[PDB]
Design a protein around this ligand. Structure first.
Ligand SMILES: [Mg+2]
Ligand SMILES: [Mg+2]
Ligand SMILES: [Mg+2]
Ligand SMILES: [Mg+2]
Ligand SMILES: [Mg+2]
Lengths: 115, 127, 152, 83, 98, 100
RNA sequence: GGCCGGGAACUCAAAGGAGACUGCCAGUGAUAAACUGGAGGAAGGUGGGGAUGACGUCAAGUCAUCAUGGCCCUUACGACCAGGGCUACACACGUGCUACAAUGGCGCAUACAAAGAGAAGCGACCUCGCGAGAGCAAGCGGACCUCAUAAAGUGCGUCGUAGUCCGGAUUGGAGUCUGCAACUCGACUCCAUGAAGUCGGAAUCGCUAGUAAUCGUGGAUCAGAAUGCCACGGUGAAUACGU
């Protein structure tokens, strides 16, 4: 119950449980779970240490959790300091992908501000 | 010899051949239970033959086209009624009273200009 | 309406019981036109009630329905321009419709895992005078009794 | 965006201007209108003034901006705030 | 075998042409099968009748295209010669295919 | 509309039909899967040189009688107002008001 | 394998006819007009839906579809080209789509429609790629071929009330297609992330039967770009004492 530096739930199936890793989704969960031949209908509570080690070996094949987040920051930071249009849209807390701004855009702006 | 009947309901048309027999029913090369999953359709199909009590003495070969499950079942009922009344006219008074000889003329109304549906109007604001 | 033209529309008894009452109850429980999903729940609830009570399969439903039917309701009438609360009689069809609707709405507000189980509980309670439909009927009865002086 | 097989897009006149400028030695910023052209590693270290609707904005090409369009470093809308 | 298709916008001016072509192909000394009534095509259009705004005011028009088919089995060498100068009605399209 | 708009439309049509074969040939080379990289680059640079109005996507459908750029119908070549006015005088063959 | 020879019976196709007219019976009614019930019949009293809008009112809308009196400009209020803007954003309002779940989500298997478009076009089979798509390439100016497998539905299993195996907004990376040209400012695919949202205050809307509600399909516009508009089918309700 210690994979990729985080704790994982024990009472759910493997496919549901492994997606809790930052960077591992449902497709990635299935790929990892099938790469070592473990069924999707087994709780990790009842499972042995050797195949846990194999699961760790297979999940160690991607940039996940903190090692991912790092470059994401630079992926944003290089955009901000370069001075491009996306950097300016990032600075002001406004949409970057050319959506509406006359209305909506609450998620990028937050709750309404009474004057 | 063979007796023939036809039935129409919604966009569904069915044709039925009835012969003296023992109680065999065929619908598009499939059994009665292999075609209609819902028991309501089976009951509405078997209504008239059960009412006249000629269930185990006749054989039925049926073909259908168009519409859906309920429309096809209603077409089957209409066709069975027409074929049976063709076989014997003495039941003319009975099948009519059971509400089967009358052809169900209800249809689907079109879409009109300015409305989202046949009669549904858009939302209205006074001011 | 202004014309008195409308009439009664024919209904088909349900297949495996031949009862119009079950047909009407299924229609009341139906949503979105998905009938096939309605009689499934109705049948599951009916069989669960039949096995739980052990009295019958259809008589338990009839007894629960009878326990809830009211006989008086309240409407508004006027004589000199002032509105009132006047008690009036209920026709049998209206009694059955009100009872079924109250039972359905009471069932829809619970915390179980299936709708058929909620239906089983509500019909059981109605047959043994514990459901909220009993409270509805009693409150209607007592509001009708309170406004008794205005009965012409 | 654009297909991978087609390759990057650039205007002929701009390409000739920048190649001549690089060959002849570093010069003054090049005045241009084509905001839709892509930036090249050849264009590194030169200054290009690009149109934005009413003016020409100088931009100095750095190494990190290779791969984008010339129109992403010159805005066209002016906004300070509300009230 | 020669099959002929006939198209028209009206169901009366095409019936006369069909009758005349079948009766004239009968006389040359061949056998004719038909005519075959084929499904018509309905094309519907809708337009706005106001020169400015007034969205919910429209006219709906339609165009009906009729269709007939005839066949000739084992024709005469003179049947085609006779049919090359039939001079059908103006407003009917005729298509011949061997 | 104006006269200048129709003049621009006709000039665009003429230029578009003048350069059909050359543009088709250049687009065929560009879309080709197996070709030299320098050949593709030169073909792109050559296609970029041809006038913009030669592109058949620069044209806008306009009414034949008035020139209106909105409410166009391809089957008739006229806007809705012109189609209605012509059709109600029995000048479009076979067209009549529908009902069902 | 209607697959073949065959057949014109059936469905259907498209032309012409029949039928429904208070026609018949009984009662009331001023013998009438008319109303009520009944026989028969597929349909009974305007069978269902559509087109059809009197004389006029609002000095209602449109001089930017078009036409037109008067006034106004004429090396400019006329004409050409490139780039930008019509897509901005502390805010308020109208009309919609997706949800807040168990009558449900997810996986596998299995049935039943109507209507319409296609020549600079619809583009099948086969091969390649996880996918959007790519290569090669028959048929079709069409009751022939393509678009193009309907979905809800049914059987089995899993989920067991959790902001969840509900929700898919936002954001990063990698791509496909159209078009000279996807930065401002296109559409779609894969991987990664996973916001508000637990049924909505004062108020307010639509609908009388194949109607409301719910699920799918097509077209015009158009190089590319629908949650809008115009059409087509599947399932299929509750209630109307009375003014
Ligand atoms: Mg519908
Ligand atoms: Mg009239
Ligand atoms: Mg005015
Ligand atoms: Mg005005
Ligand atoms: Mg311009």
């Amino acid at each position: 119950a210690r994979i990729a530096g985080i704790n994982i739930p024990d009472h759910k199936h493997a496919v549901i449980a492994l997606t809790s890793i930052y960077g591992v989704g449902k497709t990635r969960s299935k790929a990892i779970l099938a790469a070592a031949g473990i069924a999707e209908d087994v709780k990790i509570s009842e499972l042995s240490e050797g195949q846990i080690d194999t699961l760790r070996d297979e999940v160690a094949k991607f940039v996940v959790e903190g090692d991912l987040r790092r470059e994401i920051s630079m992926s944003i930071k290089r955009l901000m300091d370069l001075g491009c249009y996306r950097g300016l849209r990032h600075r002001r807390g406004l949409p970057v992908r050319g959506q509406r701004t006359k209305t909506n855009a609450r998620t990028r702006k937050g709750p309404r501000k009474p004057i | 010899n063979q007796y023939y009947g036809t039935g129409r309901r919604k966009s569904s048309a069915a044709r039925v051949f009835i012969k003296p027999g023992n109680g065999k029913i065929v619908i598009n090369q499939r059994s009665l239970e292999q075609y209609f999953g819902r028991e309501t359709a089976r009951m509405v199909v078997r209504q008239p033959l059960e009412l006249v009590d000629m269930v185990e003495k006749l054989d039925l070969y049926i073909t259908v086209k168009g519409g859906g499950i309920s429309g096809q079942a209603g077409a089957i009922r209409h066709g069975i009624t027409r074929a049976l009344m063709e076989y014997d006219e003495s039941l003319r008074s009975e099948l009519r009273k059971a509400g089967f000889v009358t052809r169900d003329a209800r249809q689907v109304e079109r879409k009109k200009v300015g409305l989202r549906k046949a009669r549904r109007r858009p939302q209205f604001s006074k001011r | 309406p202004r014309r008195r033209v409308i009439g009664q529309r024919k209904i088909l008894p349900d297949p495996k019981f031949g009862s119009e009452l079950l047909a009407k109850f299924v229609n009341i429980l139906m949503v979105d036109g998905k009938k096939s999903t309605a009689e499934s729940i109705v049948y599951s609830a009916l069989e669960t009630l039949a096995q739980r009570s052990g009295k019958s399969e259809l008589e338990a439903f009839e007894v629960a329905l009878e326990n809830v039917r009211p006989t008086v309701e309240v409407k508004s009438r006027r004589v000199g321009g002032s509105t009132y609360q006047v008690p009036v009689e209920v026709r049998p069809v209206r009694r059955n419709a009100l009872a079924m609707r109250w039972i359905v709405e009471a069932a829809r507000k619970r915390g179980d895992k299936s709708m058929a189980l909620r239906l089983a509980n509500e019909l059981s309670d109605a047959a043994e005078n514990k459901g909220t439909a009993v409270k509805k009927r009693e409150d209607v009865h007592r509001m009708a009794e309170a406004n008794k002086a205005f009965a012409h | 965006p654009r297909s991978l097989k087609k390759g990057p897009f650039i205007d002929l006149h701009l390409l000739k201007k920048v190649e001549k400028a690089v060959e002849s030695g570093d010069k003054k910023p090049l005045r241009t209108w084509s905001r839709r052209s892509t930036i090249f590693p050849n264009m590194i270290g030169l200054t290009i003034a690009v149109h934005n609707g009413r003016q020409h904005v100088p931009v100095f090409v750095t190494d990190e901006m290779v791969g984008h369009k010339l129109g992403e470093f010159a805005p066209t809308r002016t906004y300070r705030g509300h009230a | 075998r020669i099959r002929i298709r006939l198209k028209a916008f009206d169901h009366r001016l095409i019936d006369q042409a069909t009758a005349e072509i079948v009766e004239t192909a009968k006389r040359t000394g061949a056998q004719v099968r038909g005519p075959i009534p084929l499904p018509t095509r309905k094309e519907r259009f809708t337009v706005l009748i106001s020169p400015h705004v007034n969205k919910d005011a429209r006219d709906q028009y339609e165009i009906r295209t009729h269709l007939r088919l005839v066949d000739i089995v084992e024709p005469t060498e003179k049947t085609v010669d006779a049919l090359m100068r039939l001079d059908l009605a103006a407003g009917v399209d005729v298509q011949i295919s061997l | 509309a104006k006269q200048s708009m129709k003049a621009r439309e006709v000039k665009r049509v003429a230029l578009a039909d003048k350069y059909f074969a050359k543009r088709a040939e250049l687009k065929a080379i560009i879309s080709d899967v197996n070709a030299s990289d320098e050949d593709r680059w030169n073909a792109v640079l050559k296609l970029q040189t041809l006038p913009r109005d030669s592109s058949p996507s620069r044209q806008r459908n306009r009414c034949r009688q008035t020139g209106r750029p909105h409410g166009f119908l391809r089957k008739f070549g006229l806007s809705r107002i012109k189609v209605r006015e012509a059709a109600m005088r029995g000048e479009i063959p076979g067209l009549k008001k529908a009902s069902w």
